[PDB]
Each structure stands twice: as structure tokens, then as C-alpha cells.
Amino acid sequence: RYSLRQDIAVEPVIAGWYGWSYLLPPQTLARFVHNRFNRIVESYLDDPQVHAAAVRQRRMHGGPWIHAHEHRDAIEAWYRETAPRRERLDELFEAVRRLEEDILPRHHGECLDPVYQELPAALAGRVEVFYGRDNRTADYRFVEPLMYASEYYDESWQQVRFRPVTEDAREFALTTPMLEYGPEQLLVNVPLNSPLLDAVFRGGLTGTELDDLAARFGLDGERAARFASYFEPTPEDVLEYVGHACVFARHRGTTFLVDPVLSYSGYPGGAENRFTFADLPERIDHLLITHNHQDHMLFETLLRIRHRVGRVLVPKSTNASLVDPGLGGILRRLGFTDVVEVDDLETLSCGSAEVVALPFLGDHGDLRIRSKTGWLIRFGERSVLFAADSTNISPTMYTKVAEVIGPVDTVFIGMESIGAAASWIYGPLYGEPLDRRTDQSRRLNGSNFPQAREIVDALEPDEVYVYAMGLEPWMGVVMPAIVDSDLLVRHVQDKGGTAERLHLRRTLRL
Amino acid sequence: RYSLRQDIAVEPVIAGWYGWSYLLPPQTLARFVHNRFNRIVESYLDDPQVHAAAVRQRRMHGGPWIHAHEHRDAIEAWYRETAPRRERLDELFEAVRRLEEDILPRHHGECLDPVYQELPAALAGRVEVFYGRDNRTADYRFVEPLMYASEYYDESWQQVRFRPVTEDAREFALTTPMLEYGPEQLLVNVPLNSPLLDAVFRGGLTGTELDDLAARFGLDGERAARFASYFEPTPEDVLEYVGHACVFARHRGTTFLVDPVLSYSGYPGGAENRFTFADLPERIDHLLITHNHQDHMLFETLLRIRHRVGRVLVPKSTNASLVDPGLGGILRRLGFTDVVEVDDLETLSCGSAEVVALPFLGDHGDLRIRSKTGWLIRFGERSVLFAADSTNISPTMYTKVAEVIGPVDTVFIGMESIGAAASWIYGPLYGEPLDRRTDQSRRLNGSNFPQAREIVDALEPDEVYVYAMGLEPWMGVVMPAIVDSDLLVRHVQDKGGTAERLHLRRTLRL
């Protein structure tokens, strides 16, 4: 009997690209493909040189640049093979532009029933329209499950690409098409929610069982043998930090994992003491996610642990808009079948703990998005709060919050006190651009020193760690402020308590 | 041992008025008190005559008219006793006007963080602000649980008023202050979620236990004896229609009740065959509610059955706005401790059935409100759909819906094909008025004949009843089209199937 090697990664791929939340729902896919992914490809076909030149200065990583510039011929063939896809998806892009731009501004406060009469065939039956607060300006929302039911959500445009992992750091993956760039890699068509991937990550297969598996993925010849080679012979009360904003926990034998992202292992030259896919218990009872940003809920990680998961807790949103579509339903298309959505300050009991959802402000470019929460976990008398990227930009909200929830022992706050422009993530979903100087004042930032101070001062914790920092090398898949972190470590220590910025790993007494 | 008499009603009262959803959350209370309830009282103090004159023509019921005009002195004293309340609530009304009118339009697409700096003390920490789709127009939402935590939600402004019920029909109750107009009535201060009301509706008390109970409500002397007199000595597979849009169901011993409203009994001169508080099983396993309109979820009914209820299913909304605030949280303040919010086309298993939530369009004045769903219930091979007031104003939505949910046997649709102006309910929550002729085209209507036809034609049911009609006399508490109903009864019958409009009661084979 055999199992996947710790040093093979199985990378999520949707419509040619490294896979994440907003590529799943056809209506957001379409805004990205049209307004970003085609622009990146065409720009590259025209001058491979810019991209190479760009890729070479480390400091230009994260821009709209293809990292496998050597492979011009393959990329061109791929673009052209997929033209009927990019074209059926543009049919949706046009419907939506048509409704936001030609149909909705026609109306000024009267009955809207005349609109369902005029909807593009793409949207017919799949949207609801209404006025906003002024009663005169018309808006809309998608009926999400009907979208997924439509021909525009297509499971066949999904894939996984197996490849070896030889070191800690990761190259920035979001702007480069997912293809077989080397014989070590294996690109395979399967839907992301498939139970075949579950077979894989679970393992314990005989050699003939692997052949069967591999034949159900439609593999044979050398591909089937590459596939086979990715497999090797099958070999309390804790609070473990493990990377970026990901924290593991056992409490009277119930397991918790917050904002999942994990590194790999099985290769020379690692970093001592990492917490890896290999360090995981049998079952993950409760998976918690603070928001919808890749650094907090990485598809690659999630697909891998899916088979071990009990319940997923996530914050409730019903906007069913482009900028902000239902987290919970995304998780369901990924194959998670027990997902619970929690409103502000609702309380769920979890094994022997109690989990409370907390209000979470900012980090989203002052955009209309409801998928954010922090979590407070009460393990009997000790009680820990995970705040992720949430910033304290509303003076008293924390006082009022404390009045309802009682005292808190331990706090994790994230101080990416300056990060990206919000258009960097959300930009292709907008309707038209903002004028540059405005767009510029709309950032994704974590709490800085003063804000962070006032969080601490209003919750009176005895322990106070700062995470979500983006230090660990493997976060490079997807992505001054230290001055501030340190200001805070001293503040909290000077006031008679433990504090510490986190990097790489840490056991902690629970 | 004793129990409440079937012929005593226990009427919900918030801040002086017959109690319902939008009076619960302080932010909506405040819009109603200021923009409607004060206007009604003052107008009456000035000329009791208009009101009497108005009350006397039946056809003017439902307008802004006080029904107990004889009792001028009492009403005046009540108004003046409660001035410090109406004044602390105006402090919130002003905060909100201030933020919608002075603060939010100042901003044009830049960072909003400067706003939490300027928030009225009333809202400090209790709101979140953001841009809408155009990215330039600022909007907001309340953090609902912090509102309820605030001094503006005040349980002490809540009450119940016991009174006898001597006949089927009910006088229109929403526009007249809840006071003791007669020695038969008993007005009592207790919070609506109180477990003391549960004691009452449960009953089985000894006479000394009633005295104890009555002493915990702070009663004695003649009041305690009136209270006591409201008590008398303690005395399969069904599908029961029972009134308006309320339908009961047993299936392999699990009980369901949809859109609850019930009549009373124990008085001469009733209507034979009513389904009453007395006809109810021991336990209500699953309570379903399609939307947030009083005709579909009457506080009076709900408070009475609270103690017998298992789970409440309700549609999910996160708008946490004025026009549309969280149904689920309202139910929690009323004392329901197991409430589940269901998104479009999510499926919950319920005892031996499966309940699916269905998209629901219209009936809400093209306003931004997410609290609406129909329910499909699968009892094994028979499968029944409750559509309430939802109108088929989107051509294909029903085709697409059917494609996902499979075939349906039985259908209840509501054909109040013309009803009220939407400002009649929602009017006091708006920011300013619409110009009259516009407001006029924004109605709350059920499906008419053609729309209804196309629902039937796309679901192919064998049975098809029309409800939500507002026939039953007791609906008068809170509230041409028959031509259309009948058109539909014939249509469905001519195409080889059962059809029928419902009135008063009906057993049905399940």
C-alpha cells in the first residue's frame, strides 16, 4: 500500500489559471478573464521580452507578468485551443455590461417589472433587480445557484497539476498559465470537487488500485507512470501557530484549524520545525475562515485536507454581487458538504468549545463585501480571539464588542499595516475604472500601531501575538510595518504581559 | 390544575403599539415612531372627530386612524407619560438622518476611514460604511447585535394585553394605542421573550402557582384576580390548510407549520370547522416562514406557540438596513432559540422530510430586501411547494428552477393580484418621500392570472390551491382578484387536474 508523497504538490487550476475563489462563479470568472487574463496573455504574445525583463527583477513580481516566458509556443497553442471557451464566457460578460450600462439606468423609481422582459438570454431568470436606499437608483444581484446551474459554470475547464516541491519559497503563481512546463509535472482534467482527488489525498492504495485510479482520471502510458511515481509506501491540548494566519488547536480531543495554509516536506534543505501536511491529525473537526482572500484560505491547502474535515465555519454574506459572492457556496462547489455561515456575534458550540463570530472592519477597500469575520474561541476558561487582517478603524466598536462578549485572554492581530491597492485584487470586477489618484487611496491594510494599541487596551489580553504578516517564504505563491509590530510588542510588554511577533512556527500553551 | 382559556387573546405590544417585526430593532422603531406613530397621535389629539368619522366608514379602515376615539383622556396621559422615551428614540432618528444626509454624501470615492471619526455618539461603533457598485456613492449597514445591545432597544417598553375574544372577525389593530379600554382587558409589563409568558401558554398550573406567576408579573388586588380569571380547568399523515397562507402538516410523525396565523375558539357563534390553537399537536417540530409581512408571521400567534416549537426556518438576509433587517435576529429577540437561515435552493433535511428554499421575486415594492423565500417540501414521493405572495415576474426563472429541483405534485400560490401601496408598510423607513405618482406604481402584489398560469405550466402539478387571499375574517387584525383566481381554477382543471381556491379550512390527503 501507497500514499501521496509529502513533497508533491497538487495545484488547483481553473480556466488555465491558478485557482481561487473568484474564478469559480462564472460571473466573476468572466470579469477576470476579460479584464485581466486576456490582457495578460496578448500583451505577452506581442513582446515576450517585457515579461522576461520584468520577471527578472524580483521587485516586479506580483505585477501582470507571465513567469514561464521560455514557453511561448505552448502558451500560444493553449490560447487558441481555448478560444470557444473565452468566447462563450464573453457572452456573459456582455450580458452583464448590458444590464449595468444599458438597462438599469433607464429606470428612475417606478416599477421595475418591465426589465425581466428585456434581460439578455444569458441572465434571463438568474437575477433579481431592485432600488437602493435613494429609491431611484436601480441595482441587482445574481441568483447564485442558478448561475452554477448554467452553461457558464463548466466543471470541465477545471484541472489539477501535480509537481514536485524542492524548496521552501514559492514563485508567484497567479499571472502565469498552468501548463506542463516539464516532464516532472502532470496536468490532469478533473473537477475540483471530484471524489477522485479524495482517493488521492487519502491514499492507502495497492499498486493495482493506483492503476485503477489513474485509469479513472483517463491516464495511461508514460503519463500513468508519472502519476504512479508521485506515490510512496504508506508509513492532549495544544495551540500551534503554523504560518501567516493559520493556527491549529486541540482541546479535549476536538481539533480546530483557522485560515488554512500549509507548507510541504520531504525535501533536503528545509526549515527546521515547520508544521506540515504531515504534522496533521486524522480528522479536522472544525475549519474556520475569517475572510475571502487567498492568504487565508488557499485552494491548494483546502483541496488537500478536504477529506479530513468535519465542519467549515465562514462568515455569512447574501450580496450575491460581483465584488462579493457567497463564500459558503464556493466552499460547496469545492466539495465541502458541511458548511455553516455565522452572523455577527452569533455563537456556535463546537465539540467542547464555543466559537463566537466577531465584527470585522476594513481590509476590503471600502467595498460592499460582507464575507469577513474574526473568531473568538472559548475553550472553557481560556478564550482566544483571532482577528486576521481586520483593522480597528471604528473607535468604540471594540469597547461595545467587549461589553457583550466578556473578557479575553489571548489575541492574534495582523499588522500588514500597509499592503496592496484594492484594485490589485478587485480591479477587474469593477464597472469602469476610478481615476488613478482616487484608486490609490483605497488600500487593503491591516491595523497599524495606534489602532492595534487601542484593540489591546480595550480587550485586556494577557498574551498578544501578531500574525498575518506574510513572512514565511511559501506565501510567495500569492504575495516599515515591522517598526509598528515592535512598537506594539513593547507597548504590551511594558504593561505587564506577553507579546511577540510570529515567524515560521510556535507551540503555545493551551 | 388550570390553563389559559381558548377565548382569551394575549396581544403583543411594543412602545404603545400592536407589535410586529419592524418595531423590534430600535433603528426601525425610531423611523416608525417619528414618521408615523407621532403623526397619528397628534393629528388625533387635535381633532378626535376626523378619526371617529373615519373609523365609522368601514372602507376607510387601514388608514392612519385611531379606533378607540372615545378614550381621549387616557391616550393624552399615555402620550405624555412616555415623552422621555419618544425623546431618547428621536436621538437615534437624528443620528441616522445625520449620517445619511450630512456625512455620507460628503465622500466621492476615496477612503472612508475619516467617517468613523465623525459618527454621532448614537452610532459610534454600531455601523459599517462602504461604497456601492459605482464605487463613488457611499452607503452603510448597522451591526445589528450591537444595536440591540444599545440603550435604544429597551425591553421595558414591551407589554402584553390580555382580552376576551367574542367573535371571528378582528378590528384593525395597527394604528390605535394598546391600552386598557375596558375592565375585561389586562395590560401587563413583561418582555416579549420572557419565560413567564411561556408558563402562561403552557399552563397546567395549580391555583397557588397562578398566584405565584401573577406575583412575578407584579400583579395584585383586582388586577391579580382578572389575571386569574383568564384560566380554566385543564382538559398519522395529514395536510391541513387553516387560514390565509398558514398550512399544517404531519408526516411519519413529524410536524410542520408554514406562515403561522391562527384563530381562537370557546365562544358562541363561531364558524364550524376552524383550525384553532386548540387543534394543535403537542410539539411543532419545524416552523417555516416565507417572508417578513405580518399576514405571514403574526406575533400574537407566534408568542402563543413558542413553547411548542422545535426549529424555525426563515430566509437568509445580511443587509442589516432599515428597510430590511435580519429576520432571524428578530425571531431570537422574540425568544426562539433554534432558528436556521436558508439560502436560495439550499436543502435541509427535517425529520423524515426534505425542505428546499426557493427563489421568491416581488411583493416588496422593488425594494432592497432579501428576507423572502418559498418552500418546497419533499415528503418521500409526494412533494409540495408553498409559494406565498411571490409573483412570477421573471419569465424563465421557474423553468430554470424546475430543472434543478425535479417534478412537483402540489402547489399553493397566492393571488392577492392587487393589494397595497408599498409605502403603506415601508413608507416611514424611506429617507424622503417619492413624488406621489411614482410611489403609486410601487405596489405589493401577488401573482395575477397570466403569471400564475405560467407557474403552473412550468411545474406541472396535479393539485393547485390558491391561498394568501386574505378572506378569513380574523385577518382583519392587519388587513376583481377573484375573477383571476377563477380563471386559474378553470385553466388547471381543463388541463386534467385538481384546483381550488381555499377559504376557512380544508383537510387534504397527504
Ligand SMILES: [K+]
Ligand atoms: K453548470
Ligand SMILES: [K+]
Ligand atoms: K439593550
